[PDB]
Swiss-Prot record, chain A:
PANTHER family: LARGE RIBOSOMAL SUBUNIT PROTEIN BL34M, MITOCHONDRIAL RIBOSOMAL PROTEIN 34 FAMILY MEMBER. This is Large ribosomal subunit protein bL34. GO terms for molecular function: structural constituent of ribosome. InterPro entries: Ribosomal_bL34 (IPR000271), Ribosomal_bL34_CS (IPR020939). The keyword Magnesium does not apply. Belongs to the bacterial ribosomal protein bL34 family. GO terms for cellular component: ribonucleoprotein complex; ribosome. Pfam families: Ribosomal_L34. Keywords: Ribonucleoprotein, Ribosomal protein. It comes from the Bacteria.
From Swiss-Prot, chain B:
The keyword RNA-binding applies. One of the primary rRNA binding proteins. Located near the base of the L1 stalk, it is probably also mobile. Required for association of the 30S and 50S subunits to form the 70S ribosome, for tRNA binding and peptide bond formation. It has been suggested to have peptidyltransferase activity; this is highly controversial. In the E.coli 70S ribosome in the initiation state it has been modeled to make several contacts with the 16S rRNA (forming bridge B7b, PubMed:12809609); these contacts are broken in the model with bound EF-G. Residues 27-52, 220-271 are annotated as: Disordered. The keyword Acetylation applies. GO terms for biological process: cytoplasmic translation; negative regulation of DNA-templated DNA replication initiation; ribosomal large subunit assembly. Part of the 50S ribosomal subunit. Forms a bridge to the 30S subunit in the 70S ribosome, contacting the 16S rRNA. Interacts weakly with S6 in one of the 3.5 A resolved structures. In pull-down experiments interacts with CedA. The modification N6-acetyllysine is found at residue 241. The lineage of its organism: Bacteria, Pseudomonadati, Pseudomonadota, Gammaproteobacteria, Enterobacterales. Residues 38-47 have a biased composition (Low complexity). Keywords: Acetylation, Ribonucleoprotein, Ribosomal protein, RNA-binding, rRNA-binding. GO terms for cellular component: cytoplasm; cytosol; cytosolic large ribosomal subunit; DnaA-L2 complex. It comes from the Bacteria. The gene is rplB. This is Large ribosomal subunit protein uL2. It comes from Escherichia coli (strain K12).
Amino acid sequence: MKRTFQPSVLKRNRSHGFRARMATKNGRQVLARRRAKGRARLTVSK
Amino acid sequence: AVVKCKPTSPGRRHVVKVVNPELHKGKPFAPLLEKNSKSGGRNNNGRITTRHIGGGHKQAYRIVDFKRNKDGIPAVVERLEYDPNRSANIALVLYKDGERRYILAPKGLKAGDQIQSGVDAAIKPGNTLPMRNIPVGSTVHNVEMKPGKGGQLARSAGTYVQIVARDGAYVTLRLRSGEMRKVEADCRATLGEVGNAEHMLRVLGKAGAARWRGVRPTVRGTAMNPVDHPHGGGEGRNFGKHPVTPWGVQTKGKKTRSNKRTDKFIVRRRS
RNA sequence: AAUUCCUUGUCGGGUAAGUUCCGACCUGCACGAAUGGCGUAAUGAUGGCCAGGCUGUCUCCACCCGAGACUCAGUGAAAUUGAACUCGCUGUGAGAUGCAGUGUACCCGCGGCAAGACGGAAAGACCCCGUGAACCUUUACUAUAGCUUGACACUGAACAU
RNA sequence: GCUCGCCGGAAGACCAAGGGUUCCUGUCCAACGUUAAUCGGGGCAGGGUGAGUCGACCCCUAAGGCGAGGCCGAAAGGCGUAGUCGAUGGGAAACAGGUUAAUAUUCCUGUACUUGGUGUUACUGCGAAGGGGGGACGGAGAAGGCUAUGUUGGCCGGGCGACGGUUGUCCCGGUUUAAGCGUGUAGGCUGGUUUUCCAGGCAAAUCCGGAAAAUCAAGGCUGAGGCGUGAUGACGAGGCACUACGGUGCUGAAGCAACAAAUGCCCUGCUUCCAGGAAAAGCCUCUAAGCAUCAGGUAACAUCAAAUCGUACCCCAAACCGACACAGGUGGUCAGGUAGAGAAUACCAAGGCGCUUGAGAGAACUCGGGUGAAGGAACUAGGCAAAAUGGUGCCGUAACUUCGGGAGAAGGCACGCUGAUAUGUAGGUGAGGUCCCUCGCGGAUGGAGCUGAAAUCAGUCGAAGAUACCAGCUGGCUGCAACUGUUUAUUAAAAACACAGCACUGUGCAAACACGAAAGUGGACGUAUACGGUGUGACGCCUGCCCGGUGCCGGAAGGUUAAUU
RNA sequence: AGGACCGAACCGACUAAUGUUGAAAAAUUAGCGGAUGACUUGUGGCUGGGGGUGAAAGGCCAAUCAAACCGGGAGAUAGCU
């Protein structure tokens, strides 16, 4: 049975990568919220 | 020519084909070709703006000359070609100076016939002249609506318009729809009728034939649920309301023309 | 009749016997002509019905080959669980292992069966209730996008009546 | 280690995606492994991934994203031009052998190739963000010529048989060799060459396109494979000195032919059809602005450079997605033998495995199967399930029909093996020899050798010859839908949804309509034989009556009627 | 020639049994349908919540759909347990 998660590094970065988050105001707010929370891993870049 | 396919299997019993042997059996003129990417009926927002559009065979656009501004240059027809972007056929014309262009095919234009555009051009099918010079009552096609804009009327498979009267700067025309419209006499027009009369006689014969054209299936609307269409659902087949479009418009006689911008060039709507 | 309530309508065919099926009849509860009517070859993992072949489907089960079940060694769950020294019957309190009377019964496992413990599982979905929701409908109410009408503004010039 | 069993269009081999050390060696057995564990994809330590040619990066672009200005929008922001990004596509070059416990087209040996920089020499019109060519493109079908590959023979080496025979028509194994370079064949495409002229290719042009003459027919391009060379080499069954029986030096025979043959190659070809089949760059040419005893361009030689990153291992699975060492899911490539139409199926080769609890017993009952007296649907809501039919060839085949079908209708007969026809035929393949020549990978004749059906006749074995696996039950009446398709992922596959066809209606293009506060976009680079919406639903015969209601489309006399005044 | 025929791969999911604290939060086994097309598949892209998409089932939109998910208004309100 095919499951929901079909990994793809290229699609992973384009959808949730660091540059993608910086591309929009709302995405930049996501990083700001995560930085305020002190997240060790800001995004899924690596 | 119209030929009926033999009923060797379902899906071919009712297939009627329009075979034209005169059409070129080869690749078109590459220089006058352009990329034509499909849209699926979706605009720049990505939303379906026109339904029932999608799929179909890949097509390459042909640069058809709808202006015919090469005044005073005799041209000779090289061959007739099949155009996937339009119902009518197109003809490859070679001008006396070595330039090749694509034009709509009139009723009786073949390889070797000569055509010419301009005020002094002869009154023969395929020739383009301003409607001021064209005698009243003759049948024309590819009519221009504005001076120099390019042909915009009677471009279909076998359509044509006729000049009914010359009142001065404007010429009244009887369009295929029956509309009596007037345009400036300076507008250009092509003599004759676009020749594909048999185009309306074809029978697709099967569902797949429509899909080849890029026409996706149409869901009626009475077969949907109320959340989807005004015709909605019901237990069985009820349909107890006035017919409407999606989004709630009568679409059973209700006139939707509200332009009012020109509303002066129109003499009689139709019928 | 995918439509017929009365109804298994009536007659005929098929069967020893046919509420189904097929063919007619018309008394169409409550068919009907593009929310189509009546036909229709072909097609269908489609509905109904009848035959030949075929058989453990059955009369009526028998034997056999394997995997479990069973025993030994190793590892090692689960739902459930107020507490239990946790029997039958009749009666009682509204269908009793637990009350009354009476009968029966040495203590404890293992393999089986599933009648009861109103067995386990899911704060019944049916039903009603709440001045509870949610979507949906419309000639319910009140609004509103859109469409449409006119006035004024953007907006002037002469001429004639 | 010897047997046995299982897969073998994989349960083998090589990758992408993804994972990220699971790879190799040593060591340890608490935990992890559904048991034990000396073992492990477990713990610990060490080791391991070598590139001008593979891939990425890089050059080029598709869908699409972003977007200087710009247009639009309360703000946020939206769309989009010039541009710039974006592979799943296009663009230069490496093959064979050997080698490590673990890497190799990356290292080593041998033999090659590509694109650039600099310099020398000779000959020289060079030059672009421009022009043209090219790149460059569909589906189906059809053969023909080939190769991969396989079979047999020949050759070489070895063998003479645990039990009758086996020195022969016997048995086992091997018989392998690339890129590159040269040759330019089967076959495909195209008529060349020279001069003159021209409203075209945003300006120019010797290039492209077009026009008019002259002159010859042989010019050119593309092109699998074969052959030669690469190769006096490498590899090589097996031997000989070493030989911790763990393995290395040296040596190492034959290394040919015939036939069959692909879904691969010629083929981005050919034929044919309608639904009419990417873009851009590299590359080849054209000149402009400009530079000209320069600079640049062409060829040869020499020299230098080709960086950086990935490279282990798994990759139909115990390493990826499923919480698991989970009967699930996961794209590409490779495609042996016998039988067979076949990538089905059976049995096997190479290779890989026996699926991480076993040992006994041989109860009920459950699960998966085999067989069955007599009867044969009496079962049951229902022939559910099971049983049965099953192949090829020939004969034969109804109603009905849209004349295609129905149809493999139904039904019947023959199938093994041996021999002969014919010591292996018809057919296919085709050597030597002879003849011809513009003598060449040539043509004709020629038929050796090899390969090889099918049929007839006769004989013969069994209960049974399409013997296994594999492999249609058939027929009659009838409802519904024409049909192929589509649908409730995870209880509904249907008579529902689509459908071709039909009709009504809207829409004259800045179209109707749709998404958008707007710009704008789709509709459409379309134009009434078009497009949107609605209903109906192939086809055949037809589709009657009613406009009071509601809606829609017109109408003008009057009545009523908003802001405003 | 064919939304032609028989039939593997491939894509489907009609019947039955098993399983139902399953090997599996939909699978296995034996049959079954399509299998040159309205086919199927890899990679990437686009459409966003009263919205998308939908050969239409209220289907699907990350095991969730008559209005997804996450955070917030928020300790919504609960004449009810």
